[model samples]
Every structure is written in C-alpha cells, then in structure tokens.
Target: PTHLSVDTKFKTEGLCVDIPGIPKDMTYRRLISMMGFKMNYQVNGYPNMFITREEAIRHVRAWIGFDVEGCHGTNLPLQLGFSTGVNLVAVPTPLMYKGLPWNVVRIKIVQMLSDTLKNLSDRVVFVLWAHGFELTSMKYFVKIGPERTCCLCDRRATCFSTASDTYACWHHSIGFDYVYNPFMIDVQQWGFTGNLQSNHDLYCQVHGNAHVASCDAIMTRCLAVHECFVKRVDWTIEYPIIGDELKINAACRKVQHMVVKAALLADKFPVLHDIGNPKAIKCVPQADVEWKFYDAQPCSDKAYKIEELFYSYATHSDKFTDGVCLFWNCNVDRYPANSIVCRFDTRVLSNLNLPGCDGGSLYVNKHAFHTPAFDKSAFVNLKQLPFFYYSDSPCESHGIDYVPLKSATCITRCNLGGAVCRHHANEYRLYLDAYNMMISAGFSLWVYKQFDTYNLWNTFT
Candidate 1:
C-alpha cells in the first residue's frame, strides 16, 4: 500500500515579502542590504550605548517565546489569505480521434448548427422584410453534419464499416461517397404540432439500407410549406413571379425542380422577364391601370427624351402602402430600366410639389426640356391625365391615387401596338392616348430623355 504525508513550513522574512506562507524546502531569490549597522554620532570613531540590567533582561525575554494562556484555535472564524506554495499535478495524454470526448464534439457541432441557422434566418427575414412582410411571421431551422445524412444509409454504413469483408458500392464515386440528406426541420412543428405531416413522410422514403438519393425531395416539401404561407389568396399558382418564388429564392440556392417550373410558368406569364429584354410583358391589376404612360417617340426620334421619378407614399387603402411612377417611354423600353426600382425611395420624385396632388408627393419629368413637347405632355400623369388644356370640367374622375409598386429590377409592355398603326402621325396620336389609358389603368411608366444641348439621346438606350 502507498502512503502520502503533507509537509508545511513558514519562513518569517520570505513570508513577509510574499505577504503569505512559504514552503519549507523550496529555492527562492534573496536580496541583501549593504547598510546593516546603525550610526553613533556622539563617538569620535565608534561608540556603544549602555543598557540597564532590567532593560537588557526585557529585550532578552522578547527574543525568547512567551507562553500564551487562554488561546483556542477551535470555534474561531477562519481567516482567508492567499499563498503561492500550491501546485497542480496530473498526467497529460495526446487527444486521439477514438479518445476524443463526445461532449466537446457535440458542443462544437451545436455551435456550427446554431450559427448556420442564424444566418439562414437572417437571410430569409431580410428578403421577406424587403417584400413588405413582417419578420415574426417567418421561422427557420437547419440540420448539418452526420445528423443531416439519410437515416437508413447512416445506420447501414455504421454497421457495415465494422465488418471485415464489407464491400463498398460501385456508385460510391467521389462526391457521392458520403451523401448529404439535408432537410429543413420545421420550427413551427415544435410548438403546435399542427396537421402538417412529419418530414419523414413528406420528404423521405427509405429502401432497406438506402434512402432517397437526393435532397430535392425535402427541399420541395419545404418550398410547399413556404408557399402555403406566402401565396396570395386571390392569385393562381400558375401565375409566374408569385411572391413564393421571390421568398424561397431569397435565402436558399435555386432548386432545379422549381427553376424548371418557373421557366414553364414564365412562358404563360411573360411579365417575369429578365431585365435585359426591351419588350417583356408584365401583369398589372385592372385597378392599377391608371399608372401606365406610353411614348410615341422612337429611340431615334430627335424629339424623344426620358425622365424617371420615384414616389413613396402611405395610402389609406388596404392592400398598398407606397407607389411609384414612370413617364415618357414606350412600355417595352420602360420596364427594363425604371420599373419598380426598390422598396425604399432611391430617387425621390422631384415634382412632388405639383398642384392637385394631395398628401402624397409628385415628381415632374426632368427630360421634358430636352424634348419637343416640353409643356405638360412630356410630364405624363401616372393616375390622372396631365392637365394640358386646363379644362374646368374634370375628365371622368378616374379615381386614381398613388399606390406603391412592388420593388423590382425591370418591367415589360405589349408589342402589338406597332403593327396596327397606319401612319406615323396616327401612331404618335394613338401612342399618346394608349399611354394615357395605361396611366389611368395604373400601368407603371419609364421615361427616356434626349439632351438637346449635347445632341445625346437617353431613352433607356
């Protein structure tokens, strides 16, 4: 049997220096003082002071220990003081893969998952908020690492990897060696456990020691949940450029299945065109028809000019909070350059101080001075027709009010108007009327202006 004994020590001088107790047999650095003798000024060379017998005896008794009576160490409060004599002893071993603590790995993985989920949530909320949706209405969750792998495959690999004669799959090629079975764990399920089916049923299908080979199944289901929450009650799913597409694509990479479907949907609803095309068709509500403005001047026309204005307004209406206006360009060229620019006002409408407009502001066409019709025609009305002739009688009271358009990168127009016109004059007249009608119908306008002084035309060109 092994026995251990603890030894303690106290060094007066060193303890005073450290202001604590010192160990008995430990090496320590010491400082020596050169002035160790006292001076005697009364003596010519050296002098000594005489001491009485009683004083000498008292000094001697002070040097020897005196017996202390009535001193008890028990039942007294312990006084705490710090000392540097303590040391720790333990055997150190290198950490190996098999010997690594599970708790540490768990904590690290959990931290990674937490960070990833935080990022995903931020991205999702950013997009939704940009689209004018509330942040609290949305929620997100993420799964990663081995836990994100297919359950059946995971169990099979774990069990078979220990076998001596186990063979690997021929299709275990490169990237496919370890399949990622990522899934969106619906946070909404944790609290309510609503009628929604389990992710296993909705996304996964196990076959013996294998599982669904792709993550698309889970992603598709997640998309369905997202759409169910975001889709407008009035619109059909067939309509391209639905809010669901924007919300889903805001955070995650584009899914192949959805991209294929979006392309097909884009064909029926051509408004979802890319920003580069000049003549992409867009959908507008019948109520918003008054916002559109059309231009007769071609890109080559000497009189053609373009002016863009943006407006932000909160309305009493139930559906919309803000609105924008574009003026003086054909619908084809208008959408790509100046259609719904951003959720917030990037370029405030300059003419917001114009007469007749109420609490909402207005912006005039800056490019009007460059064009032939600099008066009021160049400055087209978004909801109401421009007062060119100053008629006292109100023209049909279009009931048009400024409404904020959804933020977008581009817009589009119908192309059939060119073939129907007989003459250029008629074409121009009809273009003006069509433009006014579109404005009264709430179609957004994008204006292009040419500079007369510099002989430079800027009609979305």
Candidate 2:
C-alpha cells in the first residue's frame, strides 16, 4: 500500500461554505467533493476536467488507485472473509477497561468519544497498484497496426510506370519498390501479428528506419511486459514466453529477480507484505456441494418439520423423544436391545444455557431440539439430511502446458516453449483486424474535449 496523507490544506479557502463544520462520516465521496471544489477554484476559477459526478468519482478513485474492501485497519492487506457453517468456535474474553485519568480525560474524552461513535462509518480503500500495472502491461501486448493490406494498386500487375514495370499507386504512397503505398495499406494491421504485406511494403519503403522504430517501440513498452509477467506469476506462477530474443529474455529474468527482491522488501515493510497476500484468505478449500429439497405443495396446507443436529455434553437431562433413538451401536450388526442408549443428565445442563423455562413452565427444553413428534405423523416422513463432501485432490485432468523461458536465468526456463508462441500468434491476428478498420476510416483523429477557461471559472465558484 502506498503511503498517502489526507492533507486538506486547500480546503481552507472554501472552509466557510463547503467545510464549515465537522463532517459526520468523513467518507471518500465527501472528501473528494471538498477537494475538487477547492482544486477547481485554485486554478483561477477553471472548471475541473471531469464531467459528471461519476467522472469525478472515478478521478478520486484513481488517486487512491485500488480497492481496499474488507482489509483490516491495522493489517491493510489482510482481507476479512465471510464466516459460514458451524465448527469449533473460539470465544474471545473481553479486556477489562480501567478508568481514565482526570487530566487526560478532560482534554481527550470528547475526541475519543467522537472517534468511537464514528468507528463503524469508516470505509476501506483497496490499493490496486497490481491491477494498474497489469493494464499497462496489456497495452504493450496490443499490436500497433494489425490490419494492414497490400498497398500496391490491384491493377498495377498489368499497368506499367514510366520508369518501371509497376506504377506507383495511392495518394499516400511513400516512394518504394513494388509500387508500395503506406496510405493504401492499413497501418492498424501492423499490431501483434506483423502485417506481412504492410511489413514487406513498409520495410521496402523505410528499410533500416523500420527496424529502429520497431526496436525503440519494443524497448519503450518492455516495462509493461515486465509488470504483466509479475502479476501473472502472482496469480499462477507458471507461464511460457515464446522465442529467445535477448532483450525480452532479459526482461523476463529481471521480473523474476524483482519478485524475490519485492518479497524481501515486503518483509521489511509489514504493510506491503500484508497487501501482497490474497484477499479471499481461504483456509479451507473453496469447493463445496449444497443440496436443497423442493416441495410442490402450497405453504397454506403443507406442514413442515425442520430438524437440526447439535452436539452437546452428556449431563443435560433431556430424554430422547419417541422415534428418536440414541443408540451406541459399535457394530452395524448389533441389535438395538444389546446397544446402550445414551442418557442425558442434570450435570451437563448446569453449565450450558439450554432452552428450558423455570420449573413453573409447561414446556420442556433440551440441549438439542428434535421434532420427533412428527417423524411418522400423517404430514411427515423420514428424510435424510443431505451430505456434502470435499477433498483436496490436485487437478490432473489438464496436463501442464510447459514453455521454457527464453532466458536461462528465468525461473520458468524449464517449461516447454510453445505456450507463449501461441499467445503471440493470437495477438498478431487481432492487431491485423484493427489495422484494416483504421485504414478504411482514413487518418482517424481522436479529439478530447478540454473545458474553456470561462466555463471552468464559473463552475469553481
């Protein structure tokens, strides 16, 4: 988690209007609103670029950069999981509170009381640095122009130029052999998969210049690849990279080295260590089966009897009701008459809080409740409770698709090499499609709206 300060110094200017009194909840929405108002005013009445409340919300969210839901206040990275099912429960003994000192009480009591009252309103903010890093990494994998087609004129096969057999075609054609035209072909197709025709034409046109640009672009975006690999490993360590280019191989090796270094650094900073841990924090396996019984009868006439089994101490003197036998059968073949019936006693009820009324009450309560009265009644029948089972067996159906890490130093070096190659190939195909679309549109220009100075000032005030 990144260390950030909640310094609202800028709020002083609009303190009289926006923040006159203490905020009841001090939520992120209120904080950002106050901050936005001040920030907008600070730039000489310039309007904040964000358009709607949602846009502003997104801006504020970006500043914090991650989700922090269910994280512990003290341990920022350790998320709280929902509790389900009955099991061995441990109860905590509350600490005995001592009285506060007179001097300290006089100065701090009100503030402490305020904090205690507002405690439940506190919201968690998850740091999404990992996610942000991943998005950037994905951008690198995106092909620049994957849809490019042949730039030479379709009819140029028979047409003769004044200087050569093939005539130059298209308005955007850069002078090159094979009558190649950059404008005629889609540049968008040059993405992940190199537009073979575009690459050939562009290469013939630009020659050495293309290599320099390609290499530079790859190097510039290499960080994204590194970040992606780190996130992928954190999720599932095994991944394969295609080919053995020295630069890409070195980047992969560096990411592995950084993971170890990061782990070491996390140990030094406990907060970071906690944030790196999985949020679900599952001790038990997530796999579980649930069964539900359905009935076609209407609720008005149908009689229902719910029976739940609960283990209790033997001393509770609750006699087993009719049709509910408490047999201690050691063997399956043992007769009911030979088996001892477990009896409930008074000693067990002494410590436990059983659901029995005082001696004056007509109802008799027991440690565990059972509706034995309905077992064989007109509306009731024997029904076995659903049994759900789970096992920690390794998934073996899908064989490991290993790919050797191009770099010798990479931890994934031992795996097979085809996995990453397939990934690269898929990306290339996608880029080609996008390049075609861009070419058809003809020099598409993206324009972002910027607020005019006058409108910005009016909004700030």
Candidate 3:
C-alpha cells in the first residue's frame, strides 16, 4: 500500500481517487510494476530489469526510498513467503519532504474543512509562507526558470526576479518584507497546480538581489506540482552548495550541528530548521563508484549499478535521452558489457563537455536518460519507467562506448521501462492489460508533439 491516489489532479481537489475501490491485494512484484514509471531504469540492457520478483521488490523499496507503513506504522523491509501481496491499499511518509530530486508542493490531505467551507471537505490544501505562512490554494506549478523575469510593478528595472521568491504586482510594487512574511508565515504568491497559475502572462521577479513590492493582487500560473512525501528516517537535511540551489541533502555530523527544517505549518509538527555557515556546510563528494555496463540478463544485481546518473535539467516537457541505446543493438536486459554509449543531440548532449564523457570513465550512470515507454513515440521525455534499485559493485573494468547519435541513428531499444508501465491506483490490472494490447500492436504515433505537454495522453486527464 505504498501508493495512494485522488483524481490525478488532486493538486487542487484532493483524492480519494480510489476510495470507491482499491485492489486490496496485489503481489509485491506488481507493486513494483505500479511505480515502475518513476523507477525509470534497466539492468544491463536486460529486456526486463527484474529477473526475480524478490529483486524487483527490493528495487521498489529503494525506488520508494521508504518502507511501506503497515496498519500501524512501517512494516518489514522485505516480507517473506512465496508471494507477498500488498493490499494495494492506500498507505502513507515523513521526516523529509524534498527527498526526491524533483521539487513539489507539500499539500495536506484533510478529512474535514471549516464548517463554512464544508463543501471543500474531502479536498486537501496546498500551504506556503504566503499571507503569513498561511495555507492557500492548490500548488502544481514548477520552479520558475532563469529565463522568466520578476513580477513587474510600477518600478524601474530589477534583475533576478525568477530566482527570487514570487510576489504579486501589489507586493512587488510596495517592496516590503511581506513576501518573507508569507514564506515565514510571510508574503508569497500562492497558486494551484494543473498547469494553471494565477497569472498566465504576468511576469515574476527577484528581490535585491533590494526592491520593495507593493502589489498585493493575486496572479496564478498553469503548472503541475510533482508529488512529494516526507521520508521517515530522512531526518537528514538538505543544505546549499553551488548556487541558490544548494539542492544537496545529507545527514549532519558536527556537534551543535543543527540544520533548519522548514516549518510544517502546523506547530504540532517539525518544519524547516537548519541554516549554517557556508564553512559549516560539509564538503561531500559523490563516492567514487565502481561500475559495469549492464550487458547480460540482469541476474546478480551487484553488476547492475546506478553509478552514472545525470541530473535531468530538462523539464518534463522534454526528457533526457540515453546517450544512445541503439548503438548497443541489444535490449536493456542485455546491452554490450563494460561500455558506455554517449549520444550527441541538441539539448540532450548539453552536458557533453563535462569530465565524465570527455574523460575515460564515461560514468555510465551519469549518461542516463529515460529507458523506454509503452508509447515510445508520443513523448520520449515523459512516462512510466522502473525505479528498481540494483546492487552495486566495484567495476573490475569499465569503459565508455562513444557513438555518433544523429536523427538517423535514433531507434528505441526494447526496454519495458516506459509510459506503458503507468499503473492506475484502481484497476491497475486493467490498465496494464489495455496498455499491453496497444504496445504489442506496434502502435507508436505522434510522440514528441508540443501539444502533448509534459504528460502522456489521457494519463492525468
């Protein structure tokens, strides 16, 4: 019961998405298959990464990054017996929120709302530091990119708006501490998800690196808030490193070592608490990973490592690509061993100048892109992929396989890691069967179309 659902657009409404009916029971392997989209990986080019049901379950736990909680608290890391079935029942997370690489809003699902707002009862509300750190509307939007500018008020010009916390024209014009007031129970521009923002054409801005915003008007933007959860033991904190990102999260070590965990809105629970001297911030480097290019049926998980991982900068509107899955000429379960295939494309290859590809290591994990989807054509960037965690081992020897990836060379290899893997919370068995029918029919058309947005056709619709 690791998963729960409301309408796919629960960003605003709230989900009992499957309240009417939940599977009540499904094998652990099937559970892994359900979240496989987020899992997004393949073992040594193995046509199917999960050689064993148990192994698949192991990866699913890692992919989830948390143990599925039982009727009480959390349950065993790995349950025993022939077929361990999870009740496909909705389960519930914890100590950490920003655990995943992606950014998302932490909306609270509620069984009750105000008497006046009883009509909004089943719905959950997205909270923020806006309006005195108050809980506001739905939040499915995304982090504003640098290309976007700051909110425009009746002021001269300013820089870094997109990077700065967003504010309405009123707040932007007045230029006060209200935004922080909302953020810290301070001034924040709040909106809902569903690709809908308060303001579609309005501009957003950054503060002083100082400027005062007076505008208090509301503006919304169309955006999707990715799902996120609080990792139970993930008590560790995320601190800054390179830029404003400081995206790295790790546990603290030094004594008197207290990090900020943002407030949970409810005084009853813990919220943001840590902030420290940049020097206090530890300098942790990514471990020197041992590796092997998955070349055979993934058996011993040890050979299948997630060593070479590339942080996807591309928005879901576009997904990253495996440097070149075609060059290997085999399915994911069996790609050439010990070789990394680097693809050269427009933005996909943007990181080519990095040390990994340029250097000999080729760090296979770093070159990762989406594996495969049921509808490989609609959009290469989005959809279901495996989240299986394979065992890692030191590489006896590893090398990169450089390939000239061009439009002509682009051909999808058969890796069962794609949108076809999408599992609806209710009647997942039916979704799987229906998608299976479409994929086996060799039906791939109109993928990569701009209108498709960052999601599959009718997936969240």
Candidate 4:
C-alpha cells in the first residue's frame, strides 16, 4: 500500500496557528481573549468552541485512521431538515424515472423555494453536498498523442493558446499541476480540449482502462449539471480546498448541510420585492442583489475542522507519562504515547493544583482520548492489539496487553515480548474508558469503527 504519512511536522505548539502574529505557546486564558479572530476556536463557544466528549473523540478518531476502508464522511441528516425549512411540499406525480429530469428537477425545486422565501428574504440559495461511489466510465479525456484541430479556431494544430502559442492538443493544459477543482465556473465547459474524439464521447470503444474513468459516473451525477443551478442558487462545498492538504480532506462524505435562520432583527440579509410572486411581467432591478458563494469557512456547522483533529503531545525523554501534555499541537497524525492535548476545563484542572479529591489527580489523561493504533507506512502483524493506548503503572488507562508496543512507524524500532517486532496493523479497537470518564458524565466505553462508506451505498435496502 501507499504510505501517506507526513515526515515533517507543521504546527508544534498547537493552540491556534491562524492567530495573526501570535505564538502557538500562548495561555488558554490569553488565547480565549482573541477567539473572535481565530476562526472556529471559541467561535461556537463562549471562549471559542466547546464540545461533548463524543465530538472530541470523533475528532481524534479522524485523527487516527477513519480512512482504513475509506474516509466516509457524515449522514448530515440536518441538511435535509434545513433544505425543507422554506416549506417545500413535493406532490408525488406518478413518480417517473429516478434519474430522469435531474437538472430540471433541481431548477423547479429551487425556483419554487425562491418564490416562497422572496417574502421574508430577498435571495434564497440552494446549498448542497454531493457524495459519490459511481463507477464513472471507460472512455475519458486526455492530451492527444498527435495532430488535432483547435476546437475554437478550426485550425489544423495539436492545440492553441491565447495571444498564444501552444502544443500537442495541449488540450489538457488543465490545472497548474493537473490537479482539478471540479466545480461550477471552475471546470471548463468544452471538455474537447483533449482529442475531441474518443475522450469526448460518453463511453470507451477501445477500452483504455484508467483510474479516471471510475469517477466519471460521479462526474455525471454531481458536476455535469452544475450550470443548471449554478446561477440559480449559490453553492459551496467546504473541507477539500486545493491549496493546503488537510487530514479530513481525504474523507469523502462528510459535509455540513446547515440552515442559517436569519435572526428576527437583522437587516443585513437581502429581501426581494414581490418575492412570493415571481414571473413578474416587467421586473426591474432596484439595485444589484449580492449573492456570494460560501467560500471561506475552513470548517463547517460543527463538522470538525482541519485544525480541530490536530494536536501535539509534549513528551520529554526523561519523563514519559503518556498523559496529554496539555499542549494541543498534535497537528500531523497520531503515534502511540503520542496522545492528544486536553487541558482541564479550568475547574477540572484547577483541582490538579491540589488534592481536592473531587476527581482523580489525573485531570489531563481523563480528557485525552487515546488514538487508535496506527503505524506509519510500515505494515505490522498483530491480531489482538488494543485499540486505545494503555498504561500499566498507577494509570487511569492501560495500553493493550500481549500484542504490544505503542509504535506505528518503523523507526529504528523494537520488541513485542515474544512476538518479534513487526511493523504495523491496519484495524484497531480504541478503548475509551479513560476518555469516557472525562467531561461527559456517561459515554461509550468501547470506541470502535461501525460504518464503511462502500457498504453504506450497498446496503440501501
């Protein structure tokens, strides 16, 4: 398999890196003071953001390896609920083809929604998320091997460029590095930039087996008709941006479909004239309505952020407690003994400066959930390995027994009792006893995997 682990660490201190010129080693109290500018942090909470133990563990799990089978995203049940909020009542009409009139359906549904929300809000947008498993197709677009005519000028040449000079059906003169942003206004309309022959067609005749074909089906389902609704409703899909590589970007289905209920007293939003009634005989714009895309939310309506899943453990060689180092910079990925950073929720850790005995002395470990066993690049052979990291000496949590070693990557590494030190293991059973004992009075003791995206699409009964 391909080893996708990062060797160089990015953020070392953890708190929040986006903080304008501030260092990552600031105090929590100090950090909370500027939470407004620091994106997600405290943005949702009084300080920045707070969460149930389940939320943090979910974050940690994603930090671990939620991508074993594949990074299946979320159910996003909230999206469906919110989309129907404008009070759309679909009357079943003999239920025609499931796939028929897809773009048309989108147009009709959105326009009707606009017709209604025009009363209270001037502009109503159709925000959506697209999930996929569709095996695209065989025939695909590619830079032609030889001569071709320019799709634009009808000139005999491999390709063309503006005020320009080009080359071999430079057809694929695509994204700067062949990386594509398959979204509206982004991907070109004329895919004929390629050979304009086989690749432009729907299916393959000679069957040029390529990885790109499989996702073609997904292209058809999601991006094909973007123009149908692109201008109609403003849309955006967060998480996977092109610039920075984030851990969660690997997860496919996770998306937050949120409903922004305009507050009772906010004149900032737009409200159209005669919204309840469209097809105005002679409608004229009083002023331009600003409809912007949801472009800047790195995170979403509480669906974890790239920064949230990250944290660093500060472990010195002399004293290795394995407890959270109270340093949240585990930014890269998880390693055994390389746990999460969980500062006491003030009051909780406040007792740590004493033997208050209200809770155990280990305030840090109580909150730090163990990352599931993960090995960097190297593959190991351990069947009954404990999922959660454990400790044996006067500890709140204990590492897994027998099938030992809290190591993921093969680093000039070592022994496993009698079972000669192997490399890494794929699956893991994360024990969350210590984590469960945290802020949440009661939660799951056994933190384990329960869903797989591929099977999810298969089990649609």
- Return the lDDT, model 1, position 36: 18
**What is the lDDT for 59 in model 2?**
19
lDDT of 1: 0.21
**Candidate 4 lDDT:** 0.21
Superposed on all Cα atoms, the candidates' RMSDs to the truth, in angstroms, are: 32.9, 34.9, 29.8, 31.1
Q: Supply the TM-score for candidate 1.
A: 0.17
The stretch of ten residues in a row with the least summed lDDT in candidate 2 is 80-89
The whole-model C-alpha lDDT of candidate 3 against the native structure comes to 0.19
Off by over 4 Å in 1: 1-105, 119-221, 230-461
Worst ten in a row by lDDT for model 1: 124-133
Residue 245 in candidate 3 has what lDDT? Answer: 14
In order, the Cα lDDT scores of the candidates are 0.21, 0.21, 0.19, 0.21
Across 1-461, the per-residue lDDT of candidate 1 in tens digits comes to 01110111112232222223433342111110111122223222112111222222222111111010111112221111001111111111211122223223322322332232221111111110000011111111111122121223332111111123231221121112111211112222123222223432332232111121112222223223222321211111222231232332231121212221222222222222222114422323222132333223222112222322112245332112112222223322123221221111112222111111111111112111111111223233222222110011111323222332221111111112222112322333433444343333222322222101111111112
lDDT of 4 at 315: 38
TM-score for all models, in order of appearance: 0.17, 0.12, 0.15, 0.17
lDDT over C-alpha atoms for residue 153 of model 3: 53
Candidate 4 lDDT, 1-461, residue by residue in tens: 12111121122122122123546343333432332222233221122122222222222211100000011212211101112222111121211122212223333333433333322221122121111111010001111123344444443332222223442112223211110111011122223233212231333222222322222222322221222222122223122122212222221001100001111011222422111112222122222333222112211011123233332356323222321111111212222232212122212322111111112111112222212111231111111112232111121232334464354321111212222232322111222322233323211111012211222122112
Q: After superposition, how far is residue 20 of candidate 4 from its true place, in Å?
A: 52
